Design a protein around this ligand. Structure first.
Ligand SMILES: Nc1ncnc2c1ncn2[C@@H]1O[C@H](CSCC[C@H](N)C(=O)O)[C@@H](O)[C@H]1O
Ligand SMILES: Nc1ncnc2c1ncn2[C@@H]1O[C@H](CSCC[C@H](N)C(=O)O)[C@@H](O)[C@H]1O
Lengths: 7, 670, 674
């Protein structure tokens, strides 16, 4: 559904 | 004491049974009593061998009385995983795989020894794969020793429409993948490359171009492996922005810490903004991944153990150090367990550390209980205008038929520069004059066709300035379908009839100058440049007369290093070669000073295409990247004809067509 | 035996008021130069232990006053001594950098006092005063012969540990990026009159190095990691010790693609040019000295690499995105520990002090002092100093005991600081408390910064264009100046390249979707995506679709409004696809310019603020070249510390180096525009 970016 | 029990002699049916005897046997019995125990022919035994060293294990094939009146027994030998060519190096474990101190291989080898030599009796059983669980185990419990296989010192052979998937490792440009596939096609088998793993982004570029369907992977072998293991586990369960369409999966990476990352797509974000993200951050969107893994499985984007059928070698060996890549390779083989394993590599393997690596491979294959065999093969004998000798290592399951090495198709003379450690690994004819062999090619045959181009040709694609002028040239310009590439299936492959990659290295001006300067005679080399002389041992020295010539730049005729190569001598450096002959090995680096690479008549050095022809590359085959890299791509490649031959033999093995075993095979047209 | 009060004697007639009339207006009936607690009498100037609250810190003091006051109650006021634990830096005394640890018996003399009853005096202590100049055993003896020593005063103002009581300087820029800080420094140095050269710059990014190298031709630009660079440094020291087909040895390293962790040399060989060169391990090289020997001697002469003996300044930006990475703080202090500059300067984000309580801030400070290094710390805003942005960061001054420490420059703009002023560091910051500084220097705005510039459009693939115009405003007039007028000086007194030209003026290209989107954005002041087919309203101001109006298709068919815009901040966000105006300030120039969430986009031009527009926003001289993909250099600019700020620093320090300045005043004011 969703996820998040990383440096 | 050592008397011949076992009743009278063989009665002279023996000389029919043993013609050679009549070391000549003047009599023959069926049994013998040494000490107080009695044995008969066919028994298994221990022979006392030399002083402070192991005990030959043997089967008795003969009991006879030499003309000496001395009493002998002839026995056929059993080999210990050591006594074989793999000696020492029995220690290697691969993924919890190891040799089994009581296991042996039946040799057709025989020796005759006096009887007192017999220690005692073994019990050596024999077991075939078809027994399967316990059925073997029960036996192995019973026996003192057991053997499933046979060791032949030749090739070190450990030997007992359909579709096959192939995995190529360390495959640039897919020379071997391709050739193998072609041969396979001829065999009647369809061998398609379902995955290829290579580091070089370019070789990957080329492979992908010419094999659109295969799954190319630009990554280290190791990574691909770890990624394989996870891919299996994860494959099992199938599971601050909104994601979409995970397009990619990779383990490790440039900076990436070891672990799985997915190429991600965010809604309304475009290709740019697609990022590799760690498995954890994607937790929030499991379903996306569940989906991705789902199709991916059906599509077989990554191999699982049952899936790999045949698989290609080529790990570069530059012991623990730069040898690592073969370890990795064998590990792959271990996890995946394909039916067939083909490994190519240079000859030194058998020469270096006294053949340490050849045996590392051999063992790793056998302790894995694969049937294994190997041979050295020269590129030229197969239709190339060059002499390139490489080592090929065959392995196969016990469920399968061990392939064999196709013999030379051409008249090239082999000088047997074979390492000792393996003395008879060479696939060569032996003298049997089967001269039904073609004429060893020279350079002219290969390249006389190609149109004339200059030092700077910056065109990947250019049409042909002519027509195939020879049997070979006729051959290498042929449609993907006239050979059986089937990369594109039923239809015509792109770049139809076009001549591609005909380019030389662009020489810094002056080079263009020294080269322009050269004679275009037959034997031309730097010695013809105006500094020439001789010595008791020939040493180029400046003629003590002429002043040093300077180019149209601030540069000399640049003998500076040329003058000293092999401390002089070395007629090899700047100089032409010509149609009159062969290049021993096409190399990765085109550059004149040490290489005799120079086109015979054109003053340009040799274009890559040429080198590819030399390498047996079908012309329809494309490449990518700058020049210098294309060069490498072809320099690394296995001669395609050789791979083609292997591909055929393999095809037959896979299909089961074959004949009672021996190292090498034959074929008509091919 | 219970006496608990003041001895008595002249009570000084009155020099009492003369001396200290804060009383005589606390309160004092009279004073005494001695007092008797238990068996012993304490005079003044006596170092003593005072009783704190139960369980807590046993104070340390010099007695200033003895007196009696209304209500009676005998009092002594002593000014305090400071244990490194009592400083801003506590708990970190536990830190060890190299052989450096905090001497448990060591203190720092504040001027801070308090009044207590003679009842709480535990004993008196012998606190000896040291001094930087002193020999072996000169110090040993004083220290041995004492309860405690103090070499420095700790002032809480700036967390200042300080001493108590043309030319050249080499510079090492670590985490240099394109070297904004470095350059700026080198520019302030010029004013101070000091010649500060950047002889080494170390950054991991390839592009950052080229921009830095191109703009500073003579310098050693190392593209590698601080770790690696350090390993090299040492090993190189070892070599300088020793010697003091392959053809030539051009270069030296500690292999970064992780090689095997050993030294490597760059190799050129016999009729192959630069493009083929390789790294080969030192061992892999034969016995041949002439190559190696002559390389080390030649390089050493050229000081191509530092030895501890010579570095005069070093600055760092270590990102540090207990310790989770953040290492570069540690590695920074490691390199510093190795080389012993005479000065240290460290830029980082304010958040250090915040993250968990300035753990890192106190770590840097703690290490710095533990090495016996004058240290002070302060927060500066880019806007003061004249930039159309509010950019606040933290600077660490590491000056040496043997030297004077640089102050911090007072704001050169009237921009209003409202301090995010995290606790421990509340007192560390640069501003005018309440003072009619009257630097009218009206706060700079975008209009002033970018106003003179040729129109450019979404796609502009030309580094070098022409202005075709003259600077509009004092800033713009100021921002375009020859390296000479500005002193960049890195050029041999001959003109720099790219004179009077315009560079890197070009935005990044938006994929046609985004491009069109920005196309439809109005030119009004408050321009936002909110103004698109499909408007919205609610309590939240939240964006919810128009309807009666439906979607849209771009040429590609993608919608006008990506949903995320609608989604942002509960949808109350007003940021996506926003225009600036000429009267607007960017709080901070950011490493990445994309329209999606930030309002990055030209007041009038339909495009994103171009790289050069940002460099200007960041204070880069218009002659400063940037290299690599438009994005990479966007990043280069975003990361960079404002050049004007670092320039002011370069000035204050510039003097500190030549030792001209007053003391004990934490901050400066610069003469013209400095
Ligand atoms: N460590 C590694 N991981 C993955 N590929 C590697 C590798 N080391 C070498 N290689 C591959 O080794 C290849 C050269 S040898 C392979 C030639 C190939 N058999 C053919 O016939 O074309 C290079 O293309 C490189 O990609
Ligand atoms: N481990 C490391 N080793 C060397 N450089 C590093 C590094 N980690 C981060 N960096 C560099 O730190 C830089 C950010 S700090 C640079 C800002 C600089 N003072 C200026 O204003 O120009 C990044 O460009 C990155 O390349």
């Amino acid at each position: 559904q969703t996820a998040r970016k990383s440096t | 004491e050592p008397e011949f029990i076992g009743s009278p002699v063989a009665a002279d049916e023996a000389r029919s049974n043993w013609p050679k005897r009549y070391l000549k046997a003047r009599c023959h019995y069926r049994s013998a009593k040494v000490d107080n125990v009695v044995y008969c022919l066919g028994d298994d035994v221990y022979v006392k061998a030399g002083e402070n060293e192991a005990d030959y294990i043997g089967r008795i094939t003969e009991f006879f009385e030499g003309t000496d009146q001395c009493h002998y027994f002839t026995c056929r030998w059993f080999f210990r995983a050591e006594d074989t060519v793999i000696n020492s190096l029995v220690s290697i474990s691969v993924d919890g795989h190891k040799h089994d101190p009581r296991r042996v291989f039946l040799s057709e080898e025989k020796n005759d020894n006096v009887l007192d030599c017999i220690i005692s009796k073994v019990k050596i059983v024999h077991v075939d794969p078809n027994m399967d669980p316990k059925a073997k185990a029960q036996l192995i419990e019973s026996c003192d020793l057991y053997y499933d296989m046979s060791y032949s010192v030749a090739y070190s052979t450990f030997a007992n429409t359909r579709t096959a998937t192939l995995l190529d490792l360390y495959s640039g440009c897919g020379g071997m993948s391709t050739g193998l596939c072609l041969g396979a096609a001829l065999s009647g088998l369809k061998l398609e490359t379902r995955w290829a793993v290579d580091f070089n982004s370019f070789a990957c570029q080329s492979l992908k171009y010419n094999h659109p369907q295969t799954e190319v992977r630009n990554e280290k072998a190791d990574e691909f492996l770890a990624l394989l293991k996870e891919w299996a586990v994860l494959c099992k369960k199938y599971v601050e922005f909104v994601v979409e369409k995970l397009v990619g999966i990779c383990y490790g990476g440039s900076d990436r810490e070891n672990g799985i990352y997915f190429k991600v797509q965010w809604e309304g974000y475009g290709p740019e903004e697609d990022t590799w993200e760690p498995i954890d951050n994607l937790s929030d969107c499991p379903q996306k991944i569940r989906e991705f893994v789902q199709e991916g499985h059906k599509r077989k984007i990554l191999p699982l153990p049952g899936d790999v059928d045949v698989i290609c070698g080529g790990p570069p060996c530059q012991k623990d150090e730069k040898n690592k890549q073969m370890v990795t390779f064998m590990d792959i083989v271990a996890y995946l367990k394909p039916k067939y394993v083909l490994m190519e590599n240079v000859v030194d393997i058998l020469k270096f550390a006294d053949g340490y690596l050849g045996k590392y491979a051999l063992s790793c294959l056998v302790a894995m209980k694969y049937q294994a065999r190997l041979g050295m093969m020269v590129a030229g004998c197969y239709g190339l205008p060059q002499f390139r000798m490489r080592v090929f290592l065959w392995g196969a399951l016990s469920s399968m038929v061990l392939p064999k090495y196709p013999l030379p198709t051409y008249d090239v003379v082999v000088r047997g520069g074979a390492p000792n450690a393996f003395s008879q690994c060479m696939v060569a004819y032996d003298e049997t004059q089967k001269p039904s062999l073609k004429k060893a090619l020279l350079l002219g045959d290969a390249i006389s066709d190609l149109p004339k181009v200059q030092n700077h040709q910056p065109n990947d694609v250019m049409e042909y300035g002519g027509s195939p002028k020879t049997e070979f040239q006729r051959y290498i310009r042929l449609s993907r379908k006239d050979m059986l590439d089937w990369s594109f299936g039923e239809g015509a492959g792109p770049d139809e009839g076009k001549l591609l990659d005909h380019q030389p290295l662009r020489l810094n001006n002056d080079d263009y100058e020294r080269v322009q300067q050269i004679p275009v005679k037959k034997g031309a080399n730097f010695r013809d440049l105006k500094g020439v002389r001789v010595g008791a041992n020939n040493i180029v020295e400046w003629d003590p007369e002429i002043e040093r010539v300077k180019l149209s730049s601030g540069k000399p005729l640049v003998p500076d290093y040329a003058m000293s190569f092999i401390k002089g001598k070395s007629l090899k450096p700047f100089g032409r070669l010509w149609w009159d002959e062969t290049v021993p090995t096409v190399v990765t680096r085109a550059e004149p000073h040490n290489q005799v690479i120079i086109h015979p008549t054109q003053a340009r050095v040799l274009t890559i295409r040429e080198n590819a022809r030399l390498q047996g590359f079908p012309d329809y085959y494309r490449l990518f990247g700058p020049i210098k890299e294309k060069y490498i791509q072809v320099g690394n490649a296995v001669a395609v004809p050789v791979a083609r031959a292997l591909g055929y033999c393999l095809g037959q093995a896979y299909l089961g067509e074959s004949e009672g075993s021996d190292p090498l095979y034959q074929l008509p047209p091919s």
